[PDB]
Symmetry: C2
Subunit: 376 residues, 2 copies
């Protein structure tokens, strides 16, 4: 077995233990400052996150996410409070106890040295010095020898008694030495170790309590992050306008379509007679020529649309789901081409309707003389 | 099926869609600011956490925890960078595209209205107005009727031709109206919806990307927190001083124990003769009396220790593992009582050794005359 009581039981080991006690205070002092800065950090993060602070699914998802982020803000604040009132305070009391313990150990150590020095050394020197005086005194009285015998017997009396006190003092010092080295100092060293190991345990609990309070991955944080993730995942893009259309939608507005105004003149029929036959033939020709041009314009704009759709499918296929913002420009180019095509189909359709009218009218005259104009 | 093209196909729906486009810009603008503040927050938390910045197990565990906390600091910084260069930038491009799209839609809408107004209304009014003039002209020429027939046939010629142009213009306007209301405007509205739903998808991806980057509970954060937790849990309190004792420990220092200095006078034996017998009896009495007092002092200090140990076990049993800092004072009181007891056992032992010497010496004289002192 190793311990302070068997390994540091010396003046040298006492020096080592004094420096140990200081080194452990320094370290806990750094720990307290480090924890103090975590408190500041979490508090100010709470503040920074706090500062970040309708039917629609995105709308509702967005509100849920901001609200949960505000929840995260308050949590970080509680981390700061909890760290401050729990382990930082416990750490401070542990420092204060060590500062007092430091003093108590060193004075108990001194006390035990002074006691040993007094009993084992100083008392002993005093006895020895007296013994020598009384012996020299008895020697002198033996030599200076009725009255003379009287002073000599007296010399012997005190010398003998002092001898006995000396013998007893030596035995007392012997047991002091023994208790000191085997029991007293080892006992003191052992209790210092016990205390320090208990304090190691306390510090372990302070560090684990710190980690639990300050953890960004604990249950309350996870639960916040899952709600945010569920809110985002609920977004259904193809459903975003359903509620908006329910609120604001209505039947199309279609103003009346023009008709042939019969108050000017069959209603809306071409006039095919002797004065107009050639003009109708001319118009059918010029309408048909124009229709050919318009039909070519539809053909070319459909090809353009087709080129853009192919280009967009290849681009889509090759772009990551989170980089689709990059396709928006081309999407818009495709829209404008589709609008283009639609305008051209409208023009083609208008010229076609005009041809049909012209064509059916000349067909229904056929091999007939165009009607004369009689003037009533 | 509901959609922009069936539900908002009117001037009113166009107003609704214009306000929609603005409301969506406002919302994305708030989202961009909110994300911008997350970036600032994470960056400054990185800074705050950064600022927090030997054999022994606590030592090594502590270093691991500070080092991992520094790792957490760098991660938060990467969250800030990644948020800034990914989704915040994508969000900005989405805003810019909407600002251009807003303009394109509204001018395409205007264009289609101007075309309809031109063909379906203005051209038609021009034809109608001319028709009426030419009819009144023909009426007047019919009435003012050789030359007279000439001007009348001419009147009819132009009236008939204008009639035909009018009829054709009406058919053209009819098809315009039809294409406009069924195809052109619905087509435009549909592509706006397609675009918006695609943008809803893009925004969903921006929000999910935000959540992934900024998550405090993601794998890289968890791994940091597990290392910290494993480091703290490794601490073995009963092992904290093993390496320290290996480095600094040494054999106890035991200076020589006093012995009876034979140069003054059996070596270290009490002198029991006629001049000392009574004094030895007196000393045994006074030593024995003192021993009784010292034995009582050991008894009382053992009782005190016992009271404190019981008090500390009850206190320990009733205090939570993380509140043990609160027992340190009482622990220290117990230490001082145990030291107290040890000092008293030393004193008892010293007086006992002295009694034994005195007692054995008088026992071995027993019923004998104490030796005379003869004076050579």
């Amino acid at each position: 077995s190793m311990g302070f009581s068997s390994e540091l039981c010396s003046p040298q080991g006492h020096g080592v233990l004094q420096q140990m006690q200081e080194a452990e205070l320094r370290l806990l002092e750094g720990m307290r400052k480090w924890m103090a800065q975590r408190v500041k950090s979490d508090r100010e993060y709470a503040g920074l996150l706090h500062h970040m602070s309708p039917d629609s699914p995105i709308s509702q998802s967005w509100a849920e996410i901001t609200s949960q982020t505000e929840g995260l803000s308050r949590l970080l604040r509680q981390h700061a409070e909890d760290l401050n009132s729990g382990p930082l305070s416990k750490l401070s009391l542990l420092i204060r106890e060590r500062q007092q313990l430091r003093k108590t150990y060193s004075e108990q150590w001194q006390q035990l040295q002074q006691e040993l020095t007094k009993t084992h050394s100083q008392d002993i020197e005093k006895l020895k010095s007296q013994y020598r005086a009384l012996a020299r005194d008895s020697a002198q009285a033996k030599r200076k020898y009725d009255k003379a015998k009287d002073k000599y017997v007296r010399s012997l009396w005190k010398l003998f008694a002092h001898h006995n006190r000396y013998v007893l003092g030596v035995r007392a010092a012997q047991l002091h030495h023994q208790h000191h080295h085997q029991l007293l100092l080892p006992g003191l060293l052992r209790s210092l170790q016990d205390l320090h190991e208990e304090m190691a345990c306390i510090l372990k609990e302070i560090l684990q309590e710190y980690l639990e309070i300050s953890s960004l991955v604990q249950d309350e944080v996870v639960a916040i992050h899952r709600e945010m993730a569920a809110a985002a995942a609920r977004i259904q893009p193809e459903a975003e306008y359903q509620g908006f259309l329910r609120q604001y939608g209505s039947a199309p507005d279609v103003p009346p379509c023009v008709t042939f105004d019969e108050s000017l003149l069959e209603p809306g029929e071409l006039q095919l007679n002797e004065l107009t036959v050639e003009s109708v033939q001319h118009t059918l020709t010029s309408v048909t020529d124009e229709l050919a041009v318009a039909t070519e314009m539809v053909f070319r704009r459909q090809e353009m649309v087709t080129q853009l759709q192919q280009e967009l499918r290849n681009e889509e296929e090759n772009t990551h789901p989170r980089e689709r913002v990059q396709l928006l420009g081309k999407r818009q180019v495709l829209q404008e081409a589709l609008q283009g095509l639609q305008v051209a189909l409208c023009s083609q359709a208008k010229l076609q309707a005009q041809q049909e009218l012209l064509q059916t009218k000349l067909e229904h005259l056929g091999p007939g003389e165009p009607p004369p104009v009689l003037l009533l």
